[PDB]
Amino acid sequence: GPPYCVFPGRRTSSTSFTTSFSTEPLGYARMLHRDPPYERAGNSGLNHRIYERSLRTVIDVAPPDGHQAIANYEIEVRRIPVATPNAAGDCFHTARLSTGSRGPATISWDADASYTYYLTISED
């Protein structure tokens, strides 16, 4: 069915990670890479990366250091139309990192500069 987002209906916890990002106008040059750096996803115990590939926007979420996930995690992206301060936003894509998986959990979409994107990662 349509993507279902539990956040922001529910509140996030101390080990959740949230961030937002913009996509640049597609006429602005990027230097693309087959394997861009992972960064720690705040206090979640996971790593993440947000990048583009030939354009597609991609989010990967994985345990550190070749480990398996020790729990189940919900990964959600909402998109909010730009220049619309009263916009409600849409639940856009979701993914799961399941207990025992190695990852990454991945989400991708056709790159679009007309929305701001909001990522949440949380343990179930």
Numbering used by the authors: 36 to 89, 94 to 163
Please give sentences taken from the publication describing this entry:
Fusarium oxysporum f. sp. lycopersici (Fol), the causal agent of tomato wilt disease, produces effector protein Avr2. Avr2 is required for Fol virulence in susceptible tomato varieties, but triggers resistance in plants carrying I‐2 (Houterman et al., 2009). The Avr2 protein is recognized by I‐2 inside the plant nucleus (Ma et al., 2013) and exerts its virulence function inside host cells (Di et al., 2016). Consistent with the potential for Avr2 to target a conserved defense mechanism in different hosts, we demonstrate that Avr2 suppresses PRR (FLS2)‐mediated responses, such as growth inhibition, ROS production, MAPK activation and callose deposition following flagellin22 (flg22) treatment.
In an attempt to resolve the structural requirements underlying I‐2‐mediated recognition of Avr2, and its relationship to virulence, we determined the crystal structure of this effector. Structural homology searches revealed that Avr2 shares an overall β‐sandwich fold with the Pyrenophora tritici‐repentis effector ToxA and TRAF‐domain containing proteins, despite sharing no identifiable sequence similarity (no difference from chance). Given the lack of sequence identity, concluding that Avr2 shares a specific function with Tumor necrosis factor Receptor Associated Factor (TRAF)‐domain containing proteins (such as interfering with host ubiquitin ligase activity) is not possible. However, it is tempting to speculate that Avr2, in having this protein fold, may function (like other TRAFs) as an adapter unit, competing with host factors for target binding or binding to a host target and modulating its function. The crystal structure of Avr2 has revealed that Fol race 3 variants Avr2V41M, Avr2R45H, Avr2R46P and Avr2T50− are all within surface‐exposed residues that cluster on a loop, forming a distinct epitope. Notably, the residues that form this epitope are anchored in position by Cys40 forming a disulphide bound at one end (the far N‐terminus), and at the start of β1 (residue Ser51). Such an anchored extension is not observed in ToxA or other TRAF‐like proteins. We predict that molecular interactions involving this region are critical for I‐2‐mediated recognition and underlie the ability of the Fol race 3 variants to evade this. Our screen identified two threonine residues in Avr2 (Avr2T53 and Avr2T145) that are required for virulence (suppression of PTI), but not for I‐2‐mediated recognition. Avr2T145 is positioned within a putative functional site identified from comparison with the ligand‐bound structures of Speckle‐type POZ (SPOP) protein and TRAF6, and Avr2T53 is positioned within a putative functional site identified from comparison with the ligand‐bound structure of SIAH1.
